[PDB]
Structure 1
């Protein structure tokens, strides 16, 4: 009869993300006239490390088109992007790794990253390290582009949505064992409080639906309805199937 650990996560007190050492939000440049009609040249100044993020972050300086000053945009660095490299962003930009282009102005089978779902949301898709979006189709009439997502999902998005050529740098990061609890400790120390995880079968019945009993066991099906309520969704929620991928 006690509020369980996943229900306490939404109150956001000790389960907030640890955001002191992060460099800022990584976004694309704002979709302005220069990117909508031509291109703009920025410069990679630093490739830095973002805390909690597996991917390195490029700091790219553009000239402000309407005032005399410099705008520093924070990009997710694509693999091969180097300091001092010019980055071109706009409809008329070229097919180079690091360049920011609308997806309608881009051929088929092109690998892109930091892809807007809607034109002007400044980067939504394929942002984690090593991830990319394949362009798998164009529907020029009532402009739409079919893309393939890193989960394998096909998705039709707008041709005016912008992506960045290349894959996200930092790939292969989950290819290393952590080997030890301290490396997971320092990994999650700058993400958020979600580790270590006590199992619900190891708790009392007051703490979890899986809690209690004279042996640690579940006792009802771990598969939970989508139409179940908070406190009940502790297991394999709305599972179409279970078990190993074996035919």
Structure 2
């Protein structure tokens, strides 16, 4: 047969375009700074708003981008790095923040610029500090617990734009605007409605799959469709998670 939809959309001419982008998002590199928030802006592909910051490096003014936490305003002064106060919207070394606190834009290793929590409405929880090894345990929004060194930086607050998934998209055109900038195929034609030249689920005198939909992790790429390496299937209840800090 021919090449499936899933492979074609991974070729280079289909990658997302950057022509409307504001810049690369991430923290400054300097040990200490005082910054001012210049503007709060929407960026074409992203639902969380961005804040433009201004800080001096040598004598010269320089500009950066952060993801906005909820409760900043244009004109606010913010303090970055060691010796910053625990005030909403400051950036601090993680070892300085008390247990049970909520944080965003956490660095996985020092000076990486911030990864981890970046989507609207999300946060992470500080669950443990180890005074020997200088590690800290953070609980991520998937439920995963990960350990990071005390020298990493983090932003104090919750990411702006929460609640967005409460309102249903009642019409086809509303879905159109949401997926127009994403990589997923919309509208999505079902594999059982294709001919066998186009998809492993195609063909036959009734619409059916005909073979089990759970497939191996090591299966060849042009036929790896369906539920890939599923441990279980169906709507029944699972089992207890195992937890360590």
Give yes or no for the alignment of 1:144 onto 2:106: no
CA separation of 1:194 and 1:116: change in aligned 2, threshold 3 A? farther
CA separation of 1:195 and 1:113: change in aligned 2, threshold 3 A? same
Q: Is the 8 A contact 1:50 1:56 kept in 2?
A: yes
Aligned to 2:100: 109
Q: SS at 1:10's partner residue?
A: coil
Of 229, 234, 238, the match for 1:238: 229
2:176 and 2:17 mapped to 1: Cα distance?
13
Aligned to 1:17: 16
1:191 and 1:21 mapped to 2: Cα distance?
14
Q: SS at 1:239's partner residue?
A: coil
Aligned to 1:79: 70
Q: Is the 8 A contact 1:52 1:187 kept in 2?
A: no
Aligned to 1:157: 148
Q: What's the C-alpha RMSD, in Å, of the aligned pairs?
A: 1.6
Q: SS at 1:226's partner residue?
A: coil
CA separation of 1:239 and 1:228: change in aligned 2, threshold 3 A? same
- Following superposition, the deviation at residue 245 of structure 1 comes to 4.6
Cα deviation code 1:202-224 (max 9, x no counterpart):
21112111222222222222222
- Following superposition, the deviation at residue 138 of structure 1 comes to 1.2
Of 61, 83, 87, the match for 1:92: 83
- Following superposition, the deviation at residue 246 of structure 1 comes to 4.2
TM-score by length of 2: 0.91
Q: SS at 2:10's partner residue?
A: helix
CA separation of 1:88 and 1:190: change in aligned 2, threshold 3 A? same
Q: SS at 1:182's partner residue?
A: helix
Aligned to 1:221: 212
Q: Is the 8 A contact 1:91 1:105 kept in 2?
A: no
Aligned to 1:56: 49
Deviates more, 1:77-86 or 1:235-244: 235-244
Aligned to 2:243: none
Aligned to 1:129: 120
Q: Is the 8 A contact 1:19 1:190 kept in 2?
A: no
Q: Is the 8 A contact 1:49 1:57 kept in 2?
A: yes
Aligned to 1:194: 185
1:160 and 1:87 mapped to 2: Cα distance?
20
Q: SS at 1:198's partner residue?
A: coil
Cα deviation code 1:52-76 (max 9, x no counterpart):
1110001111111xx2111211000
Aligned to 2:35: 42
> Any stretches of 5+ residues in structure 2 without a counterpart?
239-245
Q: Is the 8 A contact 1:87 1:98 kept in 2?
A: yes
Q: Is the 8 A contact 1:18 1:192 kept in 2?
A: no
